[PDB]
């Protein structure tokens, strides 16, 4: 709100007496706005309480290792089909989830070629689902240049660009990503993890140098290596019924004793 | 009114600070304007280095820092005298000169004289007019290999 809002008037309380409510009022005159109550958040006109300032802390900073952590967790969830289904991506006919296509697709230069590719990869149904979600927003966002909303589609990750971006930017939902300059705001839209991604072969072979294996640090980051797991065997179903544990267990007391 | 236990804080907010708050929302726009002006300058002086003239090797004062080495403002006049470079020509071939520097030591003097020898050898000088290659100018073939150098020229590695 502007710094002058509600203060451009010259008002003054009438003081006690005169049987009014002791709020600053507009000075004299032969108009309606004469002795009406000017300043103060409760008056018509006048300030709002605590005028919002521009020097509010808008931006936030996150630790660089925490940013790199999230991109590792985002990519690692893009390889689990149960997590990509749960994101709503219609991927029930994709041949293999970490979808990798040959580097020929970077040479594409016409949207007609790109849509034909998505049909062959059985990923068109995801884009066909984006069309079905094209509706207008609800609320004041419509009068603020946010009229139409839709669904996120598959994300295409390329290594280098020879026209693939021009060939795909017209398809709704598709977001192009350069493998080097990966973005967490586009790999995990809405904060939820599990966005369906499509890799090119040249981009797929560059991930072991952007993050490295556990026995080999990253070659493209100065000093970075994948985060360590807090537990190796997360399958606690296979753990509990393992013999090593069952021998060390008392008998399950499962007789209910009601009052 | 101080509560149980804390620090005695003295916030310097007793003036009218709110009238003189400088916000940094133009920061990304400034970084763009700077870069565009930096590239526009590099194109204007295209074959010459982008960083500018060479700076000399320089110690730091103030015993906290005298184990390190910086890039000075310019070469001293005696460093140019020993290197055989006229003080009014060195700026025309990209050698920063400042007449204020003195040289108390010989190794600092000798380290910079040795540095100008290494630069004068790496310098590809174009003829004043391509029709008439003059004396100190480079041979015709290496002008074909002369490209702009990025980063600080002959960087100072401590």
């Amino acid at each position: 709100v502007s710094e002058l809002a509600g203060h451009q008037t010259s008002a003054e309380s009438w003081g006690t007496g005169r049987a009014v409510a002791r709020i600053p009022r507009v000075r004299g005159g032969g108009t309606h706005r004469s002795g009406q109550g000017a300043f103060g958040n409760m008056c018509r006109g006048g300030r709002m309480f605590a005028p919002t300032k521009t020097w509010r802390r808008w931006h936030r900073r996150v630790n660089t290792t925490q940013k790199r952590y999230a991109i590792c967790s985002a990519l690692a969830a893009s390889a689990l089909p149960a997590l990509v289904m749960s994101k709503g991506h219609r991927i029930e006919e994709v041949p293999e989830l970490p979808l990798v296509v040959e580097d020929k697709v970077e040479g594409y230069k016409k949207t007609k070629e790109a849509v034909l590719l998505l049909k062959k990869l059985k990923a068109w149904n995801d884009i066909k689902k984006v069309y079905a979600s094209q509706r207008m927003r609800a609320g004041k966002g419509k009068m603020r240049n946010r009229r139409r909303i839709q669904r996120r589609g598959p994300c295409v990750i390329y290594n280098e660009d020879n026209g693939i971006v021009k060939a795909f930017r017209n398809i709704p939902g598709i977001t192009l990503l350069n493998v080097t300059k990966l973005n967490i705001l586009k790999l995990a839209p809405g904060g939820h993890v599990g966005r369906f991604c499509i890799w090119t072969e040249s981009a797929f072979r560059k991930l072991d140098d952007l993050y490295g294996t556990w026995r080999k640090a990253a070659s493209l980051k100065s000093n970075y290596n994948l985060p360590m797991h807090k537990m190796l065997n997360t399958d606690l179903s296979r753990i509990l019924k393992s013999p090593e544990i069952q021998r060390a267990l008392r008998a399950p007391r499962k007789k209910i004793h009601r009052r | 009114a101080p509560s149980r236990n804390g620090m005695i804080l003295k916030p310097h907010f007793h003036k009218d600070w709110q009238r003189r708050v400088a916000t940094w929302f133009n920061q990304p726009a400034r970084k763009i304007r700077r870069r565009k002006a930096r590239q526009a300058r590099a194109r204007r002086i295209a074959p010459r280095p982008a960083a500018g003239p060479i700076r000399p090797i320089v110690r730091c004062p103030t015993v906290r820092y005298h184990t390190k080495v910086r890039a000075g403002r310019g070469f001293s006049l005696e460093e140019l005298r020993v290197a055989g470079i006229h003080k009014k020509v060195a700026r025309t071939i990209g050698i920063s000169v400042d007449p204020r520097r003195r040289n108390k030591s010989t190794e600092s003097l000798q380290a910079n004289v040795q540095r100008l020898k290494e630069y004068r050898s790496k310098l590809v000088l174009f003829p004043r007019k391509p029709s008439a290659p003059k004396k100190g100018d480079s041979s015709a073939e290496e002008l074909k290999l002369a490209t702009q150098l990025t980063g600080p020229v002959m960087p100072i590695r401590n």
Partner: protein
């Protein structure tokens, strides 16, 4: 998507420029498509509509296969008056109902020196798009 940083996409700015466009810009906004028989004859998609042009209404209550010439182009109201497209008022006089040009297909043009030079230009630059792409 649009990438030109100097072209706005603001809703309020586009509506303001539309409802306050000067006359010579009103002319362009009030363009109509040509009929199929004219579209491959001049190789031109659409054209600003003049005062005496044969016309078919395609949308609305007055749609049909009747041909009618324009009688006036009321540029201030963003609307055109077609000769037989009228309704009865209360006191028995007829009034021209206004039709928006976008909801109108041109079946015959009012050719003249200035009009022809427009058609050829819209056709000249149309071929550039097919000789540069192919």
């Amino acid at each position: 998507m649009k990438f030109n940083p100097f072209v706005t996409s603001d809703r309020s700015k586009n509506r303001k420029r539309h409802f306050n466009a000067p006359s010579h810009i009103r002319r362009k906004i009030m363009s109509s498509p040509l009929s199929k028989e004219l579209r491959q004859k001049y190789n031109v998609r659409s054209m600003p509509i003049r005062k005496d042009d044969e016309v078919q209404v395609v949308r609305g209550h007055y749609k049909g296969q009747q041909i009618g010439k324009v009688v006036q182009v009321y540029r201030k109201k963003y609307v055109i008056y077609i000769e037989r497209v009228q309704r009865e008022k209360a006191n028995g006089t007829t009034v021209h109902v206004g039709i928006h040009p976008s909801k109108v297909v041109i079946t015959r043009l009012k050719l003249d020196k200035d009009r022809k030079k427009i058609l050829e230009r819209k056709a000249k630059s149309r071929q550039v798009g097919k000789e540069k792409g192919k």
